[PDB]
Amino acid sequence: SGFRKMAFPSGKVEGCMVQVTCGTTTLNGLWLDDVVYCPRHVICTSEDMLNPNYEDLLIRKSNHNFLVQAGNVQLRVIGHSMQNCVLKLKVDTANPKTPKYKFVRIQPGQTFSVLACYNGSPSGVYQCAMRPNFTIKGSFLNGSCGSVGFNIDYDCVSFCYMHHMELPTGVHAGTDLEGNFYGPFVDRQTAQAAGTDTTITVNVLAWLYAAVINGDRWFLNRFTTTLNDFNLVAMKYNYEPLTQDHVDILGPLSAQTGIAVLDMCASLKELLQNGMNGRTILGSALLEDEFTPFDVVRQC
Amino acid sequence: SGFRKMAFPSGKVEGCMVQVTCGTTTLNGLWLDDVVYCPRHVICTSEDMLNPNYEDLLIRKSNHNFLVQAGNVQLRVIGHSMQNCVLKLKVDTANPKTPKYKFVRIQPGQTFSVLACYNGSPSGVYQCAMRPNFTIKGSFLNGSCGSVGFNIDYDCVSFCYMHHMELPTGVHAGTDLEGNFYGPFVDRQTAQAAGTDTTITVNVLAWLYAAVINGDRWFLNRFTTTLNDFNLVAMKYNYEPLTQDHVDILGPLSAQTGIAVLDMCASLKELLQNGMNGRTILGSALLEDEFTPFDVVRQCSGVTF
Ligand SMILES: CC(=O)N[C@H](CCc1ccccc1)C(=O)O
Ligand SMILES: [Cl-]
Numbered sequence A: 001s002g003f004r005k006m007a008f009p010s011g012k013v014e015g016c017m018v019q020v021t022c023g024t025t026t027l028n029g030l031w032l033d034d035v036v037y038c039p040r041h042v043i044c045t046s047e048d049m050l051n052p053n054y055e056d057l058l059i060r061k062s063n064h065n066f067l068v069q070a071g072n073v074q075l076r077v078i079g080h081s082m083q084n085c086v087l088k089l090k091v092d093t094a095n096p097k098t099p100k101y102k103f104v105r106i107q108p109g110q111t112f113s114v115l116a117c118y119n120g121s122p123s124g125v126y127q128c129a130m131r132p133n134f135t136i137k138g139s140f141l142n143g144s145c146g147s148v149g150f151n152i153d154y155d156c157v158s159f160c161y162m163h164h165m166e167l168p169t170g171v172h173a174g175t176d177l178e179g180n181f182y183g184p185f186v187d188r189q190t191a192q193a194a195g196t197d198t199t200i201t202v203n204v205l206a207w208l209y210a211a212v213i214n215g216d217r218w219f220l221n222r223f224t225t226t227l228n229d230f231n232l233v234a235m236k237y238n239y240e241p242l243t244q245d246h247v248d249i250l251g252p253l254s255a256q257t258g259i260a261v262l263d264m265c266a267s268l269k270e271l272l273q274n275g276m277n278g279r280t281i282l283g284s285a286l287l288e289d290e291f292t293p294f295d296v297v298r299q300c
Numbered sequence B: 001s002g003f004r005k006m007a008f009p010s011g012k013v014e015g016c017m018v019q020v021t022c023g024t025t026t027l028n029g030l031w032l033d034d035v036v037y038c039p040r041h042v043i044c045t046s047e048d049m050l051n052p053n054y055e056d057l058l059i060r061k062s063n064h065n066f067l068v069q070a071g072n073v074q075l076r077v078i079g080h081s082m083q084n085c086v087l088k089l090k091v092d093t094a095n096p097k098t099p100k101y102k103f104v105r106i107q108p109g110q111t112f113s114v115l116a117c118y119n120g121s122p123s124g125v126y127q128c129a130m131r132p133n134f135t136i137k138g139s140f141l142n143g144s145c146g147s148v149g150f151n152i153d154y155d156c157v158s159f160c161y162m163h164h165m166e167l168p169t170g171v172h173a174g175t176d177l178e179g180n181f182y183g184p185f186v187d188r189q190t191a192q193a194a195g196t197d198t199t200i201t202v203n204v205l206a207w208l209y210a211a212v213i214n215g216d217r218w219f220l221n222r223f224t225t226t227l228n229d230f231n232l233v234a235m236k237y238n239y240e241p242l243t244q245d246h247v248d249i250l251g252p253l254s255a256q257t258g259i260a261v262l263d264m265c266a267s268l269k270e271l272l273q274n275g276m277n278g279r280t281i282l283g284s285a286l287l288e289d290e291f292t293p294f295d296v297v298r299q300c301s302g303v304t305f
């Protein structure tokens, strides 16, 4: 037993990380088969940060303006194109370490691992969630752009995130591996701000079910709630509305513990009213929202 | 910016994980050069685990009693020996993915990454501290025995931990890679309990420095203190004593933030005596003690492997 923030093993992603240089700008690229994916803003100069014309900056590049390095090996760029906010550099070598992979666009509430990289080398791995405001609370320094987020279900790597920028509140914005931004953000240094963030209600409930599976019962109560009454209370605490989809998704955890989803909702209403009274749940004195129903069933 | 519980990249270790089976027991092995390391308790039945005679159980077994599987490849065992509570299975093939590595023994308070594995297959990686009572607060299910803990320094993997068992409190016990237990534990089915734990003071301070580097500053104050004064408050709150060595190790973070260690100790004294008054530090309502000073320097400067 025990309950930990756990990331996927990073090895299958490590063997895909390269350094991409264009101008004086170096960041990370993802090398799959014969394509290197990286943030298109690698082609921006210091005066092209506010309103870059990516189509114009790209057409002025030759393949040999792109320096791609896989460890000590210079890769030969033989093609360049742009898909949304992702630059794709065709190279003359397929990565021999390419894992089985796919590209998946995730929804808010979903979790994934991030392999934080600098100069094409891995620094560390951690778990993140896509926040309801379409940001992630990452750990990223200058040089981290092109680091990716991923899940590994059953030997196949699902790439879901590529890191593009830090917003003024210190949270992170990026794209799927088709180059489409999560949320209303753009790859320009024009003033942008995340929407008000909310707590991921379904994930809190999943983590309360995990606490019960690990033998915590102190926060349970004898009450139930309607789905509608729960949402009226929870939104006063900046909690996301719980949908009938979310209720359904919790069904297996409901069945394993024999606590109905709306009984557990009453427990969460009460925890929001009382706080923890100097107690902890699974080692936290806050209600944790970065574990999904799927994460809890995998780990428990 | 941002600050997360961050593991080392696990790829160098993923290439060393194998499945070891002896009779009805399957758990994980570490394949380095031509030796597979695993818990010696792989040779035990249920009966055996109550009062095992490992010497006796092992001399009975032959090489062919150990089934070692590296993905879909059987390795041939050509030798078996025991070192303390670890079994060494010599195999006929050196691991071609053996990284630069050494075996190291860590101290309580030091952190490392665990690669959680099942049937020889890597499942998850997480960061954890060797607790002052020599347990780790792990996440392990049936079949995670032989999962390992490590640090990376440049291109060298330092292996520091092998998982052997769960204690009745849900915390975990194991050995270094030379088979020496961390803490007062034995590999038998018996009544064993974790000693009462204590907070790793130098790590809480490191984490307060991480918070300041990330602009979380409300807990800072005009006051300073002394080791002796702080250590009387520490002892009272079940905190490890702060040594001069610990002050020295925080040197870099004190320099890089403009908060002296004893200035930050005065912040920590006020937090222990007063609580957080409904506030949070780096998204926690508790004082976090599983980041070392080196963890904070590494994460906040982007050290790479
Ligand atoms: C050095 C670096 O990594 N800078 C990025 C923003 C760099 C950028 C440039 C052009 C358009 C959008 C974003 C960050 O992490 O904040
Ligand atoms: Cl999703």
Ligand SMILES: [Cl-]
Binding pocket: A272, A273, A274, A275
């Ligand atoms: Cl309250």
Ligand code: NA
Binding pocket: B220, B221, B222, B223, B224, B262, B263, B264, B266, B267
């Ligand atoms: Na102070």
